[PDB]
Amino acid sequence: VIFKKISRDKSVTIYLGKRDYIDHVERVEPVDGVVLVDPELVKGKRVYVSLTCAFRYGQEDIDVMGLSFRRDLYFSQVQVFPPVATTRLQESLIKKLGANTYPFLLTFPDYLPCSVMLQPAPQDVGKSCGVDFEIKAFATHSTDVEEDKIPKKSSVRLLIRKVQHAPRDMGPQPRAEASWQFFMSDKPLRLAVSLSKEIYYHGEPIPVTVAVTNSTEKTVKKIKVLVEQVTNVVLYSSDYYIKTVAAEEAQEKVPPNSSLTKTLTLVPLLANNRERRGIALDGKIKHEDTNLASSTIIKEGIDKTVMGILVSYQIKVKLTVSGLLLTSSEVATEVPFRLMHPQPEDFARQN
Amino acid sequence: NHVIFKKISRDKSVTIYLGKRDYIDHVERVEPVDGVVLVDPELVKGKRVYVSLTCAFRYGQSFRRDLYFSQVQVFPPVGASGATTRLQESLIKKLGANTYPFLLTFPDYLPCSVMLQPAPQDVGKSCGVDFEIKAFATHSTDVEEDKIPKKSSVRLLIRKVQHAPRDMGPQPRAEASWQFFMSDKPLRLAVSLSKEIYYHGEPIPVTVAVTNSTEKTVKKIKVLVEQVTNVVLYSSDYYIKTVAAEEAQEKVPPNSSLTKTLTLVPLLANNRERRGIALDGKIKHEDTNLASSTIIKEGIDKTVMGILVSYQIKVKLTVSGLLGELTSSEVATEVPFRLMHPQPEDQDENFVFEEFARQNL
Amino acid sequence: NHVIFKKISRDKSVTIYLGKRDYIDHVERVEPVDGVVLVDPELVKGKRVYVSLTCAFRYGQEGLSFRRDLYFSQVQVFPPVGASGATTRLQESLIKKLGANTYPFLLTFPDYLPCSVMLQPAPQDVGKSCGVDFEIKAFATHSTDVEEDKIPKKSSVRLLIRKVQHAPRDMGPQPRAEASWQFFMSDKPLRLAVSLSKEIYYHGEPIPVTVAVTNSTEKTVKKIKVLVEQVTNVVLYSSDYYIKTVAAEEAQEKVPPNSSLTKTLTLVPLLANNRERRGIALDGKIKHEDTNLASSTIIKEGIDKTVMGILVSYQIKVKLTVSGLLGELTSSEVATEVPFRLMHPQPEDENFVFEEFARQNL
Amino acid sequence: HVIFKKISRDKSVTIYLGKRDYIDHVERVEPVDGVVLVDPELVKGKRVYVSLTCAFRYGQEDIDVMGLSFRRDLYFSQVQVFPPVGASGATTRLQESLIKKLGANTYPFLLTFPDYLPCSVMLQPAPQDVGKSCGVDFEIKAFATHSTDVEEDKIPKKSSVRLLIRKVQHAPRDMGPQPRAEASWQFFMSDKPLRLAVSLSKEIYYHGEPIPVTVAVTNSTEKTVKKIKVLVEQVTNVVLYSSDYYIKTVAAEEAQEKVPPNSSLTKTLTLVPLLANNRERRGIALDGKIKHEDTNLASSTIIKEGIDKTVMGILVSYQIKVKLTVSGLLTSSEVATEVPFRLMHPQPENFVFEEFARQNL
Ligand SMILES: O=P(O)(O)CP(=O)(O)O[C@H]1[C@H](OP(=O)(O)O)[C@@H](OP(=O)(O)O)[C@@H](OP(=O)(O)O)[C@@H](OP(=O)(O)O)[C@@H]1OP(=O)(O)O
Numbered sequence A: 001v002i003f004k005k006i007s008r009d010k011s012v013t014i015y016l017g018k019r020d021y022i023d024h025v026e027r028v029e030p031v032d033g034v035v036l037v038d039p040e041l042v043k044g045k046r047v048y049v050s051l052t053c054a055f056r057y058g059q060e061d062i063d064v065m066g067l068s069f070r071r072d073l074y075f076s077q078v079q080v081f082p083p084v085a086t087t088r089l090q091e092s093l094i095k096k097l098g099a100n101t102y103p104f105l106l107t108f109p110d111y112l113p114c115s116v117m118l119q120p121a122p123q124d125v126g127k128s129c130g131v132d133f134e135i136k137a138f139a140t141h142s143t144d145v146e147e148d149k150i151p152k153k154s155s156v157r158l159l160i161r162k163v164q165h166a167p168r169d170m171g172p173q174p175r176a177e178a179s180w181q182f183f184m185s186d187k188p189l190r191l192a193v194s195l196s197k198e199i200y201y202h203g204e205p206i207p208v209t210v211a212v213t214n215s216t217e218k219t220v221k222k223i224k225v226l227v228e229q230v231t232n233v234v235l236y237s238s239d240y241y242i243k244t245v246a247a248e249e250a251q252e253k254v255p256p257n258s259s260l261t262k263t264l265t266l267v268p269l270l271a272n273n274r275e276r277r278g279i280a281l282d283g284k285i286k287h288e289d290t291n292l293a294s295s296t297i298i299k300e301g302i303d304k305t306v307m308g309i310l311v312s313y314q315i316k317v318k319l320t321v322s323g324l325l326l327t328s329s330e331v332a333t334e335v336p337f338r339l340m341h342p343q344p345e346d347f348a349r350q351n
Numbered sequence B: 001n002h003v004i005f006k007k008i009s010r011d012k013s014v015t016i017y018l019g020k021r022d023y024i025d026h027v028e029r030v031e032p033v034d035g036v037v038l039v040d041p042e043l044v045k046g047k048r049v050y051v052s053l054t055c056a057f058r059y060g061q062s063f064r065r066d067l068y069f070s071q072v073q074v075f076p077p078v079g080a081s082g083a084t085t086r087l088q089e090s091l092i093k094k095l096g097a098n099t100y101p102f103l104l105t106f107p108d109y110l111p112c113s114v115m116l117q118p119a120p121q122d123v124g125k126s127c128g129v130d131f132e133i134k135a136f137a138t139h140s141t142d143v144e145e146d147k148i149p150k151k152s153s154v155r156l157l158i159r160k161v162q163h164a165p166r167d168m169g170p171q172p173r174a175e176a177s178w179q180f181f182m183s184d185k186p187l188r189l190a191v192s193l194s195k196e197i198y199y200h201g202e203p204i205p206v207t208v209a210v211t212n213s214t215e216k217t218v219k220k221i222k223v224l225v226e227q228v229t230n231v232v233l234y235s236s237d238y239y240i241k242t243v244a245a246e247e248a249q250e251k252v253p254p255n256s257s258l259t260k261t262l263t264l265v266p267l268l269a270n271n272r273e274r275r276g277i278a279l280d281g282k283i284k285h286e287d288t289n290l291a292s293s294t295i296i297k298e299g300i301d302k303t304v305m306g307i308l309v310s311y312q313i314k315v316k317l318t319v320s321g322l323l324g325e326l327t328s329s330e331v332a333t334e335v336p337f338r339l340m341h342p343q344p345e346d347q348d349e350n351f352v353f354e355e356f357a358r359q360n361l
Numbered sequence C: 001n002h003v004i005f006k007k008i009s010r011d012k013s014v015t016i017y018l019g020k021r022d023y024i025d026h027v028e029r030v031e032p033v034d035g036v037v038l039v040d041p042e043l044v045k046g047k048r049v050y051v052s053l054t055c056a057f058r059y060g061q062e063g064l065s066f067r068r069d070l071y072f073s074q075v076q077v078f079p080p081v082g083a084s085g086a087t088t089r090l091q092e093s094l095i096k097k098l099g100a101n102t103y104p105f106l107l108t109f110p111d112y113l114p115c116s117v118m119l120q121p122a123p124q125d126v127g128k129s130c131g132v133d134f135e136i137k138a139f140a141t142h143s144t145d146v147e148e149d150k151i152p153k154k155s156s157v158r159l160l161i162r163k164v165q166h167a168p169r170d171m172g173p174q175p176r177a178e179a180s181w182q183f184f185m186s187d188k189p190l191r192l193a194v195s196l197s198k199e200i201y202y203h204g205e206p207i208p209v210t211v212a213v214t215n216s217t218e219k220t221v222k223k224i225k226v227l228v229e230q231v232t233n234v235v236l237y238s239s240d241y242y243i244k245t246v247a248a249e250e251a252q253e254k255v256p257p258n259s260s261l262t263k264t265l266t267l268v269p270l271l272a273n274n275r276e277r278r279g280i281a282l283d284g285k286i287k288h289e290d291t292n293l294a295s296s297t298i299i300k301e302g303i304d305k306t307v308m309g310i311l312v313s314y315q316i317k318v319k320l321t322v323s324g325l326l327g328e329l330t331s332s333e334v335a336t337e338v339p340f341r342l343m344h345p346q347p348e349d350e351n352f353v354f355e356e357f358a359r360q361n362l
Numbered sequence D: 001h002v003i004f005k006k007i008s009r010d011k012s013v014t015i016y017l018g019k020r021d022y023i024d025h026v027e028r029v030e031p032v033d034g035v036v037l038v039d040p041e042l043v044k045g046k047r048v049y050v051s052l053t054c055a056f057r058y059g060q061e062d063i064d065v066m067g068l069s070f071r072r073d074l075y076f077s078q079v080q081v082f083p084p085v086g087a088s089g090a091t092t093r094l095q096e097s098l099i100k101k102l103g104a105n106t107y108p109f110l111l112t113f114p115d116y117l118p119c120s121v122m123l124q125p126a127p128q129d130v131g132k133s134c135g136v137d138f139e140i141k142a143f144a145t146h147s148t149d150v151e152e153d154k155i156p157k158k159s160s161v162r163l164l165i166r167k168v169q170h171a172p173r174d175m176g177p178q179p180r181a182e183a184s185w186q187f188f189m190s191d192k193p194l195r196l197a198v199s200l201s202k203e204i205y206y207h208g209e210p211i212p213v214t215v216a217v218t219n220s221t222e223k224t225v226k227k228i229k230v231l232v233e234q235v236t237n238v239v240l241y242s243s244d245y246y247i248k249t250v251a252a253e254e255a256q257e258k259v260p261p262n263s264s265l266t267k268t269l270t271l272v273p274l275l276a277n278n279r280e281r282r283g284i285a286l287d288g289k290i291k292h293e294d295t296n297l298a299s300s301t302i303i304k305e306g307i308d309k310t311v312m313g314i315l316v317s318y319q320i321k322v323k324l325t326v327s328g329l330l331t332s333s334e335v336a337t338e339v340p341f342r343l344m345h346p347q348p349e350n351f352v353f354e355e356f357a358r359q360n361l
């Protein structure tokens, strides 16, 4: 399946192999495509293709001051026409389309975030924001460069996604486990939480093993296990969101001088969430192929602020503990894990 | 002298008289259509004369949707038959005893006069919202059926014109900033208008505040009034058109800021090409202006407006060294405002009668 | 049965009768003092009997000491003034019950006065005894032959009434505090959030203090201590300041590293909790049984706070004791305060039992 | 000289300091040398310590607004005075002299400042300002502890005494002859240049020192410079808890002299940025509380190489701003530029005892 889009004036048509380009940490899948020009309508002009990654912040509200912010995180441009290595997709598209088809290759660097965006809920303090990736093909004249204008009718833009996949090689995953001792009157309530591994895939079930050892004279009335998505906007405005994307409540008691081990399975999915606002996604709410944002992966030496939006996941265990008799207390603890797409194997989107 | 607008049927049995061509919508209420029908007693003997107010959306020359229909009987006379307006009482006395009054009211859920004839480059077809006042006679020569001859009827294309409400939105303001690739220092743009509602012909003072902390130069500042049109019945056509443009002669060099007020006047007269833009009448007519801003009432589905018209100030900054190496995009912000006609200002008078037909160019 | 409070002068010429010892201030208005004076016609022949309402701040003694009058009002009971008719059911009923030598009086409170507050300091406290008293005095005056009028003490009778703070119709927003600390060399915060159910609590009503400790540090919250602190500011003569614990609850939970704990402790601020009844603002004398903690002062808009004499306020204080911290990474305490107001509940012939106005001791 | 004394509630611990204000001159910071006078009976087998804390704080107490507070310790250090171990090492003339003056129950302490701390800065906002009260405080606290006091984790308040000292920014002892702080801008208007050059005598000015701002307008345009305004702006950035930004005029001179087309004008305006010029003392960074007499404008923050600016808590900087009002043909433009400079205190070079409390206004 090839994805095509044509300029208003039909002088420039762009063809891409895919909408979604894979980041698997080691390297990023480059954007290889072709531009089909109409020789009469290009005439004495030059056609370029650009790859822009930008962070954006702000939304249009009636009677609320317009506030907009944009920061380019990467820009790269190449000339396709007139022509100045190739790939199988290009060679095949050229033969399929004709002699007015010209190839382009734009590469991603290693310091960029992946597709993340966020539209807030009514109770949420800050505004709409996200990281977009735009492939734009456009024609310029030599009096167009002289006035600094690139006519819109001669241009065509595609909003591609950079998608986080797990790296191809990685050693056998350590279990993600922590333990806490909550002394209550100098008798310990011990809580251990353990996951099977550190990295889970979108759709993969997460087996959360909870081990309560109650040496206190109080009763654990209730055990609740959540997958929480933590979002930190780290450009323009320091917005913070924490949202439940999966929840199981065991509801089984742990009486005094007893211990209880239980494994609950959670699956953090956008489908579990009627309310799709306040949560970091990899695309727009309306689109069908939109998932929960993958865990941000900050490379060594890269300042976290250039990622724009930081997305992390954690298992939260809340224990309701009975009073003396009065009302009851609640302790809670977090175990971090990472959520991304599976390891890789060796244009308008559906609503 | 009060100018009265008259039109007569082909068979000259029914003549309709209106106080005005254009009826004022000022949001709170709409000015009702008060007029009189002059019948020829010999030619309407046995017949019944009615007056109707129709509002319809149209697309092509192909789809029609009625948004409002209302009808009243003028002849034979209904009840008291007495006028409800000074204009009616005065027209009856001026014309004779074969003059009968009618009052047709507008509801609050209707759009105002908007229509659009596309340019060659535009996708999508002709469309608009028309308001028709029709007076017509009906008879039976047959027990099986009543007839409505066209020769016994007379139709007027009136306009529903948007005038300003009592109140007004907060003062429009935008702020935008850009950090270009490999640039740690921002370009800040702030835009302010004096008020939220402007009148057709009124100048719009657009205050632009560029703060250039970058090592690049703002070569050009261009300020537009853009008219955004959304057809929301039959076909989802979208038009965005410049109806006014002013280009400041100032550059903004590195590590400097510039505040400047450009004055724009969005007018149909500025536009040689009158196709692709929403008007309140036909291109040919002289009294035709740019369409007023649509005002959707709370609880009314926007689709029953047929065509949505909105205005915005767009400020575009051309930046040096950017277009080659650091962006393929334009640096711009938009500030919305509303455009309509001024607020309304609230012995027998002499009547000069004129044909309802509007003057061309 | 309506309990009536009677007191008689030494010479038994003037006897005063009151419906109550305690008159209600509910912010909107104050309950006026309606009573009757029973005169002995033989002993008041040629004399004039008056009733006065005095509100005074005092400092030194509970006599040589600083005094400031905040309000004085006086009315004539005998010989009878005008109609002489009762204005209350209590008066009409007392007149019929007692006889034709019974005369009514009504003394009203204005809106700019404080309520009954007084303070007797502890040994460790700087500053002296002080308070706001309300005195109802009925007294007879006669003329001598040289032009000088006399006011014998034997012909007079004084009652120390209380002005008691009851809640208004409305109430402030729900009290909430948030506090966070980053200790020296610690990148991660200790967050404390405190919430009360409501803004106004009643004497005897339990206060549910919800604490939410979020410990992102590698230190342990060893103790959570929740206090009701009474803050007293003397604002006439001498700027004395007292802050005193009138209730304390110590949660038995620790909060270990990288954990959070939500807990609701219930406190009841009462004078009964305090063996030591000195150093704290009361609404009466220590010895008296019906004496409580002073209600929160309520300064009306436009009234200078100094004419209140003693300012009383309450707050919830939450102190977190943190491991490794105190002596190594701070010389301060980790704590937050949430203000609330403490007063009596909103406010809503008869057989009469007569009793001496004197209040019962302990 | 003048010595500053404060005594605990229980009168067991009394602290004596040489000064309220300790000098930071970039190279090093003046250490806090003082003495604690203990009452041997009231010590009663206990241990007395002296601590130096530097903390950033954020939040203010409002009636019917949720209490929100934040504190971050930037430095904590503690030494033992009693019983003596000579923790503070070698002693100083002020200490030796105070010991002989006071008695044998006087014990010396020396607490040093490191080089990664900010100076005394605090800010109480105005009504129009968005964020809350914040500042950097320096506390010297002497306090006694028992061995059942460490067991319960209590340091009784009556046995303790705290002093709020200031860390004051002075210019460093050695620095090369100061370069003039000068920039120039060319504002092309219709492709004719308006050239503005701004020059200061030097880069560092002292509190109270006048700043001679030389402005040089060269107008080759056909427009007129109607007005020249010169400001000292104080820029404040809170960089802990909340990213608050304040920009405030602390001095202003307006030359209302014109520069007509095809002419140039040089003018030297003298400004003196002072807290005394400001009736409204809220919204601006001070080195102390508003009420205190010895409170000035905050000195320029001096971030040392390798120190993350966030550990300074509040960043304070100064700049000269020159605004030129330029004529149109029916409304006018305004260009402006900034020249940064630094503002601090001058380079550094019988006992009367007084309470440490500072004099008000
Ligand atoms: O019908 P109009 O608007 O009155 C006259 P026009 O059609 O020549 O408008 C062009 C406009 O001409 P005009 O200023 O006369 O409207 C020119 O303005 P100029 O390049 O600044 O001179 C550019 O406008 P912008 O700079 O705002 O984009 C052109 O856009 P490009 O930069 O080529 O994309 C416009 O072309 P268009 O938008 O119709 O394709």
Ligand SMILES: O=P(O)(O)CP(=O)(O)O[C@H]1[C@H](OP(=O)(O)O)[C@@H](OP(=O)(O)O)[C@@H](OP(=O)(O)O)[C@@H](OP(=O)(O)O)[C@@H]1OP(=O)(O)O
Residues within 6 Å of the ligand: A157, A347, A348, A349
């Ligand atoms: O290109 P696609 O997605 O395959 C199909 P489309 O052409 O209808 O997309 C438009 C998109 O339509 P859609 O999202 O339905 O594809 C609309 O989205 P909407 O305004 O949010 O509804 C806007 O995109 P944004 O969301 O990025 O603003 C339009 O941006 P403009 O404001 O016109 O510049 C897009 O127009 P574009 O310029 O990209 O061709």
Ligand SMILES: O=P(O)(O)CP(=O)(O)O[C@H]1[C@H](OP(=O)(O)O)[C@@H](OP(=O)(O)O)[C@@H](OP(=O)(O)O)[C@@H](OP(=O)(O)O)[C@@H]1OP(=O)(O)O
Residues within 6 Å of the ligand: B007, B155, B156, B157, B282, B356, B357, B358
């Ligand atoms: O009616 P008006 O404006 O007061 C004066 P006109 O008679 O010149 O208007 C005619 C109108 O003239 P105009 O547009 O100038 O009002 C023309 O419009 P044209 O096709 O653009 O010439 C047609 O109007 P429509 O297209 O709306 O039907 C004619 O309809 P017909 O096709 O004859 O039925 C109108 O004639 P009508 O039938 O109303 O007497």
Ligand SMILES: O=P(O)(O)CP(=O)(O)O[C@H]1[C@H](OP(=O)(O)O)[C@@H](OP(=O)(O)O)[C@@H](OP(=O)(O)O)[C@@H](OP(=O)(O)O)[C@@H]1OP(=O)(O)O
Residues within 6 Å of the ligand: C007, C158, C159, C160, C285, C356, C357, C358, C359, C360, C361
């Ligand atoms: O044997 P006692 O205790 O001296 C007399 P009591 O037991 O009847 O009560 C007295 C009461 O004593 P108590 O309250 O213990 O019964 C005391 O109270 P205190 O002044 O607060 O100590 C005063 O009562 P008030 O509160 O009405 O002033 C006394 O009134 P004076 O002010 O001296 O005139 C009362 O003496 P009373 O006048 O009734 O004979």
Ligand SMILES: O=P(O)(O)CP(=O)(O)O[C@H]1[C@H](OP(=O)(O)O)[C@@H](OP(=O)(O)O)[C@@H](OP(=O)(O)O)[C@@H](OP(=O)(O)O)[C@@H]1OP(=O)(O)O
Residues within 6 Å of the ligand: C245, C248, D152, D154, D155, D156, D157, D158
């Ligand atoms: O929690 P606990 O121990 O069971 C009861 P507490 O906290 O009141 O104990 C004392 C408290 O001990 P702690 O609070 O450490 O338990 C101490 O605290 P410290 O002097 O600061 O150590 C002082 O409390 P404050 O500081 O609040 O006044 C003492 O008051 P004084 O200063 O002598 O008036 C308190 O003794 P009190 O005199 O009240 O019986």
Ligand SMILES: O=P(O)(O)CP(=O)(O)O[C@H]1[C@H](OP(=O)(O)O)[C@@H](OP(=O)(O)O)[C@@H](OP(=O)(O)O)[C@@H](OP(=O)(O)O)[C@@H]1OP(=O)(O)O
Residues within 6 Å of the ligand: D162, D356, D357, D358
């Ligand atoms: O010499 P100063 O400080 O300029 C005048 P002050 O003696 O009234 O100081 C008090 C200060 O008064 P002020 O603020 O007027 O200096 C008050 O401040 P407030 O809480 O804002 O009233 C508190 O200090 P903070 O400013 O640190 O809070 C008091 O500390 P506590 O919390 O009681 O320990 C201070 O009392 P101190 O400890 O000096 O005896």
